[PDB]
Amino acid sequence: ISDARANNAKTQSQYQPYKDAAWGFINHWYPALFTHELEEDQVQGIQICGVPIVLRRVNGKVFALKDQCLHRGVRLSEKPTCFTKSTISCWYHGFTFDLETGKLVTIVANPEDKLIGTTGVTTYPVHEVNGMIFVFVREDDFPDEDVPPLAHDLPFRFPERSEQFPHPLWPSSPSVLDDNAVVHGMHRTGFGNWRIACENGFDNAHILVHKDNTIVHAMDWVLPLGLLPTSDDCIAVVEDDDGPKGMMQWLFTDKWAPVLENQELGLKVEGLKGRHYRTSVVLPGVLMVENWPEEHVVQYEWYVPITDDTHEYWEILVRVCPTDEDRKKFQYRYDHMYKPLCLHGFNDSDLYAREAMQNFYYDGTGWDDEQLVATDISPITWRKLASRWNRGIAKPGRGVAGAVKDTSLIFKQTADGKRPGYKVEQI
Amino acid sequence: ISDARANNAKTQSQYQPYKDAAWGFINHWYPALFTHELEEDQVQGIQICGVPIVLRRVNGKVFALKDQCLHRGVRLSEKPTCFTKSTISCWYHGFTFDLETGKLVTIVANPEDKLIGTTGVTTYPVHEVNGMIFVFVREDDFPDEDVPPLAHDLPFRFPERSEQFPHPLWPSSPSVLDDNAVVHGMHRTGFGNWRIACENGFDNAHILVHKDNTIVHAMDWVLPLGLLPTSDDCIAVVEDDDGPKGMMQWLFTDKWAPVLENQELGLKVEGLKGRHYRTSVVLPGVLMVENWPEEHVVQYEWYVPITDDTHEYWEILVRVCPTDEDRKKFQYRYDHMYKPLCLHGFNDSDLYAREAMQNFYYDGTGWDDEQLVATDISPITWRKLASRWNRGIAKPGRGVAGAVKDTSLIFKQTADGKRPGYKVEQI
Amino acid sequence: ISDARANNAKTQSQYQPYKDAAWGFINHWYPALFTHELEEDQVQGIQICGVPIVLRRVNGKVFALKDQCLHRGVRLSEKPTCFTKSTISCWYHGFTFDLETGKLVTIVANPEDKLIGTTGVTTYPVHEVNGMIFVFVREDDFPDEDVPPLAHDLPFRFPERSEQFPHPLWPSSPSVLDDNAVVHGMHRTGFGNWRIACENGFDNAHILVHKDNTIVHAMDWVLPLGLLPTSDDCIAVVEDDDGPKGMMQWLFTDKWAPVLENQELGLKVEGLKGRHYRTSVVLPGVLMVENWPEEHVVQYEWYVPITDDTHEYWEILVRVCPTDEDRKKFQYRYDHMYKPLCLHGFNDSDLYAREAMQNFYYDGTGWDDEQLVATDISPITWRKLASRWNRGIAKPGRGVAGAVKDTSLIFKQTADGKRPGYKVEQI
Numbered sequence A, B, C: 001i002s003d004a005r006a007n008n009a010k011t012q013s014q015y016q017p018y019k020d021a022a023w024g025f026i027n028h029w030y031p032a033l034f035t036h037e038l039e040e041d042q043v044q045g046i047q048i049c050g051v052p053i054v055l056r057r058v059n060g061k062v063f064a065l066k067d068q069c070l071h072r073g074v075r076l077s078e079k080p081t082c083f084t085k086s087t088i089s090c091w092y093h094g095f096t097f098d099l100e101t102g103k104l105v106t107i108v109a110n111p112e113d114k115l116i117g118t119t120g121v122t123t124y125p126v127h128e129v130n131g132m133i134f135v136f137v138r139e140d141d142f143p144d145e146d147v148p149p150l151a152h153d154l155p156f157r158f159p160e161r162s163e164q165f166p167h168p169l170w171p172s173s174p175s176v177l178d179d180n181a182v183v184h185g186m187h188r189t190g191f192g193n194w195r196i197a198c199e200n201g202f203d204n205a206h207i208l209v210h211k212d213n214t215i216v217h218a219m220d221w222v223l224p225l226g227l228l229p230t231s232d233d234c235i236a237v238v239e240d241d242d243g244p245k246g247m248m249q250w251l252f253t254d255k256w257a258p259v260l261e262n263q264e265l266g267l268k269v270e271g272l273k274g275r276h277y278r279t280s281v282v283l284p285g286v287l288m289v290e291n292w293p294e295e296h297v298v299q300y301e302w303y304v305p306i307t308d309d310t311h312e313y314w315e316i317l318v319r320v321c322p323t324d325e326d327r328k329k330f331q332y333r334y335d336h337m338y339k340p341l342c343l344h345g346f347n348d349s350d351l352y353a354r355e356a357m358q359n360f361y362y363d364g365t366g367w368d369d370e371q372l373v374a375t376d377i378s379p380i381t382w383r384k385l386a387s388r389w390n391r392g393i394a395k396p397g398r399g400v401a402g403a404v405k406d407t408s409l410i411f412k413q414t415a416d417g418k419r420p421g422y423k424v425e426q427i
């Protein structure tokens, strides 16, 4: 280990909380499911930051509760059983909970037991908007009154912040919160810790990973060997109380210069061609790529922790569609252009890159022995701000799926060919 | 956690030994194989309470020894090798053991080695009766003279105990020990700890689990929302010396009342239709369902621990058949009625219920945080009596299969599509 | 455990280092790949003694470096990326290393970073000869000047040592180091620890394992129930500096008598038929079987540790072939005789024997509780010399594949049907 690395002892001590958050940052908003994944009266189970969650849509409204019966720990979502519009019951003995408050309102097989009403399961605030269902995954004792607005855990908004983050080279990127904003995309279970996936999301220099992508050649692009910071303020950190906590990278400005050659290897690029775009990231780990893949379109990504070694990788493209014609045009171009060539053709390569790093980090080795460099100012800055502003560090799961990794149930599923997942399989 | 739960600190302290019995209660009788699974000269390896056992039938008699060669720990059952009617040899170097005493009688490759006769492998008492082969799984040092009759670890017998446990609504259930008693059934490896499976076996209140079963609708049954104990003595605990240790539930008496409605959810059942039956459980964890599925027929179940997270679930139906005409009728009705509609159609639902509870309990959480209620007086009473009368708590396996859960051998098998099992694969 | 076993406390204390070497003996020469597995410009990743290694052939010469990028730990071999004839680059951010010295010569994405040249990856000496690519797997700090000749880690040579180890019943066995020596064979990943496999390699008494082999009956052989040492100098131990460290077993001499009967079991062999052969083993665990399967042909095996519970089992046959005709005869007889009837037909049985032993030993039980006998003077002698002359005990892997055994990555691969392996999958 060289003393010339960027991550010296002092620096590493500045992001200890981040090193400690393998299970994720709790008390934050996370995308749970696309709207189309939960129709009226549908019930679905998932897991975020190690917390088992079950959601149900009733009268058009989505509710979320901990997917764990108080009686004997059964997952309510495995066999959806609801007797009324305001409740959900456990399919084993009938412990029943109120969707709104999570209170144990009754027990099917024992309506007069003294336990009824004296406790209940945890509730998680929900915010559904433009095809996205967000859930505020919080600790059991996080007060309702303390729940912040969804916008605080979503990327910076434009043109609201165009003045703060000037972008003369491209039109304003829409937000999932914008009126008539349309979302198209997917989320796939990723194998490995969420942190490693997230940092890959906004890495500025990994051309080798995408050099062979079809889109790069179809568009006749000529990528740079890399991008390096020219000054200390190449990244702007935002920490105000009313707004998202993250960093904005001044791409396509003077603060970031493209590398066109490597004298040692005899490499040299000329006539660079490409796209104008800009990446930024905010807590709990949300990427925004302005002007990608095309003008007026934007890409957002999440790397939602499920357990400490699996995450749900979200990729969505957003575009405001005023008319019905606009929606059809966006849907069509997504289906035969963006989805195959970008969300897949471009980003699938990132998957192998992320998995390739996991072994160095899981047992803790990489978090100490990695040898970061000048370009790593990006991830380092992110780790520091994340350590300073996260609303909590999730505790390891206990008495839930993922608490123990080598159970006979997991071997049974693996023998059956089932990979680690996200959505709970129903009976 | 609510103070209104039935399992308060005082109560939990009364079943600490049961919380400690993950690997099972040792020094007890368990079903090993059906007679048809071991023909003359056949050898078969299994695992119970973490103890590897190999069985062989010679001259009609079955013998059981520890499936572990003293030399270098190879499982003798993997490649059945026997040179005489009274021995079994290890297929590697030929260490040979006496079927009766387990003594090392010779070594094929070294007939004059000083080790010969100075040691041997553990022997396990066998008691085969009416198609069932029971083995007394004991610790290496449990004295032969202390081995109790098989009856002591088998459910209460009738009419012998008809006076003690009156049953005016149905005829006496036969025992597998009875003359002309015929056994039909099966055993399947269950994924999860044995205790969780056993408790489900005699659970009185779980209609939601069997409400959709085909047999319930074919018979025009109308099940109750649940059964409630009306008095303190709703269960009779038997603790005599000469006999089985367990509890008899006074079903279909005024001590247990059905629940026909739930005012909170607006549920109500009318026109009560079903079957008369009674359940009881005795150590090491054997269920008896009198008058099921029909008169003169009885269902018995075992949840034999294999490791601490797998068990072998036995389901058998017994009926005394004097003539071979009776045997053909029973065999026929089993094949086209009891098996598909009951052992499978009814009980398969219990399998999903058991697996769903396992994650809450394996790491210890559930045994402390479960919130039991009034109806849980059944399992609690069983846990207490089991803690008081078990003949021993099995220790974790060491130097045997299951001792380590994530070996490269287990991953090889899993990769090949093989689920965790019970019967040792040969060659 | 009997006091009559050969491995008493005193004896066991003489091979504690061997008990401690689950991950293998490091700072030794091991077979890495066959020449045909690495063509010009081909890159391949492997793992030995827990050390990830990447090899590449440039201008006919093979180089070996640690398969771990020092930036963020990705395996360089997953996506072979080389810009010049003297380097290899990480496919993520372009950290580039010199094949010869392993020094970090540059970073494609940052040519002027201060980290450049201040560090690098470990290099491993390579010795390619007669179709075999050997690599000296060493600790990071093992000095270049201390790297010994490949011969020191290869079996004893003949006729060079014919006087020291007289062999009047057969002609001299060739070495892979001999001019015109031709190698034919294979290596397969084994599931279990390397020590267990190695000891089976030179075991003299396991007729039951090979009795049914086709070659035994096709050749009308009549094997002995076993072989016994008649004197305590039945094995010669060689320990001087200039040469291999190991032992020679005086097979087919007065020191090893065959066992033809077992009075206890009524076994008795007559007219024993077979062939003359001789086994010896040297560090790091290399078997030599002289005069097998035929005169002028010799079998060599290696049990290369990959992790502490997997190894790469090598089986090769060597014969000096002066002319092109000789090579065609050898290639032909290998393909339709040696490979199917010997390397497979005979040794495949050894695979099941090895796997069957692993469970007793992995958690440490067998290394203490195994009950060895007179014939075990063979493996005991090996354990002792190995403990005394090994050049190092490999440390468990940290931050590399195999460091953690139950990652979601491993469950993903297993779910997809992939068994634990050796050669790193590319892309």
Ligand code: FES
Binding pocket: A069, A070, A071, A072, A073, A074, A090, A091, A092, A093, A094, A095
């Ligand atoms: S486990 Fe849910 S009601 Fe019993």
Ligand code: FES
Binding pocket: B069, B070, B071, B072, B073, B074, B090, B091, B092, B093, B094, B095
């Ligand atoms: S391992 Fe059984 S005789 Fe050697």
Ligand code: FES
Binding pocket: C069, C070, C071, C072, C073, C074, C090, C091, C092, C093, C094, C095
């Ligand atoms: S991980 Fe190898 S250059 Fe970054």
Ligand SMILES: [Fe+3]
Binding pocket: A200, A206, A209, A210, A347, A350
């Ligand atoms: Fe990328």
Ligand SMILES: [Fe+3]
Binding pocket: B200, B206, B209, B210, B347, B350
């Ligand atoms: Fe049931």
Ligand SMILES: [Fe+3]
Binding pocket: C200, C206, C209, C210, C347, C350
């Ligand atoms: Fe062999």
